Design a protein around this nucleic acid. Structure first.
Ligand SMILES: [K+]
Ligand SMILES: [Mg+2]
Ligand SMILES: [Mg+2]
Ligand SMILES: [Mg+2]
Ligand SMILES: [Mg+2]
Ligand SMILES: [Mg+2]
Ligand SMILES: [Mg+2]
Ligand SMILES: [Mg+2]
Ligand SMILES: [Mg+2]
Ligand SMILES: [Mg+2]
Ligand SMILES: [Mg+2]
Ligand SMILES: [Mg+2]
Ligand SMILES: [Mg+2]
Ligand SMILES: [Mg+2]
Ligand SMILES: [Mg+2]
Ligand SMILES: [Mg+2]
Ligand SMILES: [Mg+2]
Ligand SMILES: [Mg+2]
Ligand SMILES: [Mg+2]
Ligand SMILES: [Mg+2]
Ligand SMILES: [Mg+2]
Ligand SMILES: [Mg+2]
Ligand SMILES: [Mg+2]
Ligand SMILES: [Mg+2]
Ligand SMILES: [Mg+2]
Ligand SMILES: [Mg+2]
Ligand SMILES: [Mg+2]
Ligand SMILES: [Zn+2]
Lengths: 60, 118, 127, 80, 155, 98, 24, 206
RNA sequence: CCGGGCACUCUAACGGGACUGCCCGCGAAAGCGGGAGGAAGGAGGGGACGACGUCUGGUCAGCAUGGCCCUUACGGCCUGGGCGACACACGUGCUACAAUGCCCACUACAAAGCGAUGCCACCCGGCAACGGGGAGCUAAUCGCAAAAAGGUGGGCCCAGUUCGGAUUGGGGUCUGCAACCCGACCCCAUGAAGCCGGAAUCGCUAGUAAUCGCGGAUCAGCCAUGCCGCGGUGAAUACG
């Protein structure tokens, strides 16, 4: 998560295809869930902390 | 009988028999037997001389076939090599042309497996 | 007049309505042999009747949905058993040894991470 | 077994350059980094320097080369 | 089975002859979990048994299974650093299992075209006392009792 | 004839709010048809436990959305007196249609 | 088998439609 | 590689979410980012007051932020201008124009976040780590708190080798779902490295 | 489908239900064996859950962080190339080597999910990928949709073939500013090795293995045969 790459947020990415998604919390590039806008690691952390409403541990 | 070249299929269904023509698969065999009005179920030995003449007349000049087909494919590959194209380079070395990997199996283009030391 | 049984097997339900008649069965508007007969175990769905050896005293109207047709056959078996028991409770003593009134609780085991199909561990060579 | 679509794509970078050269003559080597562009007939006879990632190779274009890409004649990798 | 004794599975009886042995033979015929195909194969083989033999196919089937059952087998044992082929008797369950497995396996070795014909011919030949399955029984009862000198390694 | 679609992440809150609506509409309206379960929408998320390779743990979570279908008949003019501003629940969204 | 483009099982395995697997 | 988070392990029973609001799939991530910015700016300004939890609730463009602080006198300020400035920054960051609430925490030695924060402060002041953990667990146990546990990670005392000082007493049944264990985590930023402080406080059974 | 009604099915909240309670035998007891009743028993089946610690295990490349080092470049922008290189070696898989099979036609049952710059019924053009038109759906009510193995009928008749679809030639579609390096898909042509695999070695004890299809996350598209789930058919064996 280099600082320059946090330039991802860009009203002018010059192309629609070049616009990818990043983790808003840690700046991750891969495993970026679109529903939460986070990565998988920040997802797990904030889910454990209980800061994601309705998110519960699954077991069946 | 002798249809569209010096090749003769015999004693099986006419469509599967035409599959033994180089420029003809199952789709082209079905198309020929359909436009020629021939039952694809009959065997080759159960074909009328008129039906053989009809099928020969149709197929002989409706697509490019064995000799001209192989010559045209060789000319295409030769043209790719002569123009210095990348595909011509891949043909020149005996490597995959359609963007497959070479660090591994892609052996069917490279022939047998020439093991070395290491 | 009419005796009802539910039955259930491997995610499948089959409403069984027993009405005294000739002995011919309807399943979802189709005949018993036009849904089945291509499935050899289909006869098993009529085993409860053979258990009491009636086989001709009850026409059946069955509405089946869920799982595949084999689980449907076994659900029909259990539904016929339940309706026949509701007809006469004294039949339970004749159906309990055969276990036709037993519910088959075998269900597809849930698939689990790290494996291939819920138990098939991925092959490893170690060298 | 290849195709792109109707309305063949050519990068307008060298498209104007080659016709500007034709308007006055047969000017020498042109340097182009756009190897994605498609070869058009109005390029036959010129000599385009195509950037292969390291240098510019002097790809001379002939008649039978129309339709392909500039990168097909500018190999990028070195082997043996 | 270390802790327990691994009680044997009880199979459902047959839908036609009411025999659990027929169901076990079906299961040994079954492939990739295709029960209906195995039942088709076996019952068409039974229809082949008749019109070729006046005897009911159930009797021929059971007599063939009895003719394939081996009495003694030979298991390996590591003694004194070496490996020996020790003869020993066979429990009835293993007799039945080996009989059905050998019946199916020898049937699929036949040159017959379709499966029902293979199974029917193998059942008939095994009932009258020949075929690949009886050859397997003879080979096992030859290996065993061919190493009688190791009978004291029975364990 | 008023469509009510409740949705939420907690079944207890939705159930309490639905019973509150039913009791507030019984005294002021007609015979209410009660709530209908409206099956749950479950959305699962599988995510590796560790920040590195460790591929075979995955600790998946879930997020479920429950819905309710009160659907009061006879929208009497007296019914909305005890309604349209009386509510405890917070994490519950309400949908109203004609 | 499932690797032939011109078959029904091939289209099903590859999850596509075409001449050899229409949509009724 | 074990011992999953207990608060997340009990988010169903005996523990509720900090953020409790409904949002569609097109709006969940935005409200989540907003809650994250709220908690970020909150934990940066109210650390001197000792905040233990920040509950966020949303209905329609209104957010009932309830901050549980052991010392509300710091978050209130003189006459109430501190809460005014904080609501001002809140309305500036998010254009939702929402209110704010403060809740005092009786016996702050029963909220594991504040316990871990106290231990981390003591560690940062160059205090005896073993004695710090022992005293913290003692202060927790000596007021209710049927169970207590405090864990401090490597580099204890500034040593070169990373260690772990255990120092727990009481009852901490981490596998019991109905345990109702408050869990807190704090950091100690030292000249020689980083210290992780974990706090478990067990109270109640059903 | 309408009238019509919450019995059944389903849906989702709560609750009941199994505790060796009862019977027989053994036993000091705990408990063990068997039985009854029961939907189910002797932990009913499956998850979640994984102690003090060990591997100075893994990751400062998710993040945080001590120290060290670079600061007209070890920072930053861009075009292009590369991560897809191939004499070779191994691991994980997919597809097969066929008749318990392959192909064509007709026909019958599932669960869990996803869907508004979205899913796209349906109509027309097109062999098709697809395009044009265009209904519905904030979605138990519309769409993805067809489940496949299966059944019924017919073709193939043991041959590297109506097995198997690698490779290559040619013609196209779609995404995208852009498919040369380096996408998927469609159509015609091509038809490879492969006849069940040496030494060695792997998984699984019941709805399990095996086999069959279905969805999802990331994603404009996709090299997904991966991964995480879902249901259909459904074994063999355990002396020790
Ligand atoms: K270590
Ligand atoms: Mg950084
Ligand atoms: Mg992208
Ligand atoms: Mg040919
Ligand atoms: Mg390559
Ligand atoms: Mg399965
Ligand atoms: Mg075009
Ligand atoms: Mg044999
Ligand atoms: Mg584990
Ligand atoms: Mg084929
Ligand atoms: Mg009711
Ligand atoms: Mg009921
Ligand atoms: Mg436990
Ligand atoms: Mg190391
Ligand atoms: Mg790579
Ligand atoms: Mg090399
Ligand atoms: Mg060399
Ligand atoms: Mg290796
Ligand atoms: Mg049409
Ligand atoms: Mg409806
Ligand atoms: Mg047939
Ligand atoms: Mg062939
Ligand atoms: Mg060969
Ligand atoms: Mg052969
Ligand atoms: Mg086990
Ligand atoms: Mg996708
Ligand atoms: Mg897939
Ligand atoms: Zn992140």
């Amino acid at each position: 998560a280099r600082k320059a790459l946090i330039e991802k947020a860009k009203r002018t990415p010059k192309f629609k295809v070049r616009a990818y998604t990043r983790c808003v919390r840690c700046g991750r590039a891969r495993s970026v869930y679109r529903f939460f806008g986070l990565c998988r690691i920040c997802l797990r952390e904030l889910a454990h902390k209980g800061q994601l409403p309705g998110v519960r541990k699954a077991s069946w | 009988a002798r249809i569209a070249g010096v090749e003769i299929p015999r004693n099986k269904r006419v469509d599967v028999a035409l599959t033994y023509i180089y420029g003809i698969g199952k789709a082209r065999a079905k198309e020929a037997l359909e436009k020629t009005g021939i039952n694809p179920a009959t065997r080759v030995k159960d074909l009328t001389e008129a039906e053989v003449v009809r099928l020969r007349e149709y197929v002989e000049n409706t697509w490019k076939l064995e000799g001209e087909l192989r010559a045209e494919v060789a000319a295409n590959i030769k043209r790719l090599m002569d123009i210095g194209c990348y595909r011509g380079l891949r043909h020149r070395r005996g490597l995959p042309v359609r963007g497959q990997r070479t660090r591994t199996n892609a052996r069917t283009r490279k022939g047998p497996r020439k093991t070395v030391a290491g | 007049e009419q005796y009802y049984g539910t039955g259930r097997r491997k995610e499948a339900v089959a409403r069984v309505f027993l009405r005294p008649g000739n002995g011919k069965v309807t399943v979802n508007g189709q005949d018993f042999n036009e849904y089945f007969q291509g499935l050899v175990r289909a006869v098993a769905a009529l085993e409860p009747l053979r258990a009491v050896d009636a086989l001709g005293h009850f026409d059946a109207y069955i509405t089946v949905r869920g799982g595949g047709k084999s689980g449907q056959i076994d659900a029909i078996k259990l539904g016929i058993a339940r309706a026949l028991v509701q007809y006469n409770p004294d039949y339970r003593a004749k159906l309990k040894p055969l276990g036709f009134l037993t519910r088959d609780a075998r269900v597809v085991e849930r698939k689990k991470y790290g494996k291939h199909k819920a138990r098939r561990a991925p092959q490893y060579s170690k060298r | 077994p290849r195709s792109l679509k109707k309305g063949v794509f050519v990068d307008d970078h060298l498209l104007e350059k080659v016709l500007e050269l034709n308007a006055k003559g047969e000017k020498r080597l042109i340097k182009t980094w756009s190897r994605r562009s498609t070869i058009v007939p109005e390029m036959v006879g010129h000599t385009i320097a195509v950037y292969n990632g390291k240098q510019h190779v002097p790809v001379y274009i002939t008649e039978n080369m129309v339709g392909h890409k500039l990168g097909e004649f500018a190999p990028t990798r070195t082997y043996r | 089975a270390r802790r327990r004794r691994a009680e044997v599975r009880q199979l459902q009886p047959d839908l036609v002859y009411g025999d659990v042995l027929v169901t076990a033979f079906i299961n040994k015929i079954m492939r990739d979990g295709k029960k209906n195909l195995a039942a088709r194969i076996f019952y068409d083989a039974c229809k082949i048994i008749q019109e070729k033999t006046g005897q009911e196919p159930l009797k021929v089937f059971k007599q063939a299974v009895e003719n394939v059952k081996p009495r003694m087998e030979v298991r390996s044992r590591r003694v004194g650093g070496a490996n020996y082929q020790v003869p020993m008797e066979v429990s009835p369950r293993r007799q039945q299992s080996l009989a059905l497995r050998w019946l199916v396996q020898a049937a699929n070795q036949r040159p017959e075209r379709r499966a029902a014909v293979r199974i029917a011919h193998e059942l008939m030949d095994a009932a009258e006392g020949k075929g690949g399955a009886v050859k397997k029984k003879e080979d096992v009862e030859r290996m065993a009792e061919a190493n009688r000198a190791y009978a004291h390694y029975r364990w | 004839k008023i469509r009510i679609k409740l949705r939420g992440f907690d079944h207890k809150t939705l159930d309490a709010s639905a019973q509150k609506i039913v009791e507030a509409a019984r005294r002021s309206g007609a015979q209410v048809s009660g709530p209908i379960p409206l099956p749950t929408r479950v959305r699962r998320f599988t995510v590796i436990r560790g920040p590195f390779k460790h591929k075979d743990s995955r600790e998946h979570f879930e997020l479920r959305t429950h819905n309710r279908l009160v659907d009061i008949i006879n929208p009497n003019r007296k019914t909305i007196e005890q309604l349209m501003t009386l509510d405890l629940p917070t994490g519950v969204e309400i949908e109203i249609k004609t | 088998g499932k690797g032939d483009r011109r078959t029904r099982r091939g289209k099903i395995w590859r999850g596509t439609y075409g001449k050899y697997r229409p949509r009724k | 590689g074990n011992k999953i988070h207990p608060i997340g392990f009990r988010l169903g029973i005996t523990r509720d979410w900090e953020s409790r609001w409904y949002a569609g799939k097109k709006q969940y991530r935005h409200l989540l980012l907003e809650d994250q910015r709220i908690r970020g700016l909150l934990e940066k300004e109210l650390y001197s007051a000792g905040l233990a939890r920040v509950d966020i609730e949303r209905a329609a463009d209104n957010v009932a932020v309830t901050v549980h602080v052991a010392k509300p006198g710091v978050v209130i300020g003189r006459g109430g201008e501190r809460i005014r400035v904080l609501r001002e920054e809140l309305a500036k960051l998010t254009g939702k124009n929402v209110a704010l609430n403060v809740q005092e925490v009786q016996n702050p030695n029963l909220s594991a976040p504040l316990v871990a924060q106290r231990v981390a402060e003591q560690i940062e002041r160059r205090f005896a780590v073993r004695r710090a953990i022992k005293q913290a667990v003692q202060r927790v146990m000596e007021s209710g708190a049927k169970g207590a546990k405090v864990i401090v990670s490597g580099r204890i005392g500034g040593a070169e080798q990373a260690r772990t000082e255990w120092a727990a007493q009481g009852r901490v049944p981490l596998h019991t779902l109905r345990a109702n264990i408050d869990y807190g985590f704090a950091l100690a930023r030292t000249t020689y490295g980083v210290l992780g402080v974990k706090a478990y406080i067990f109270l109640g059974e059903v």
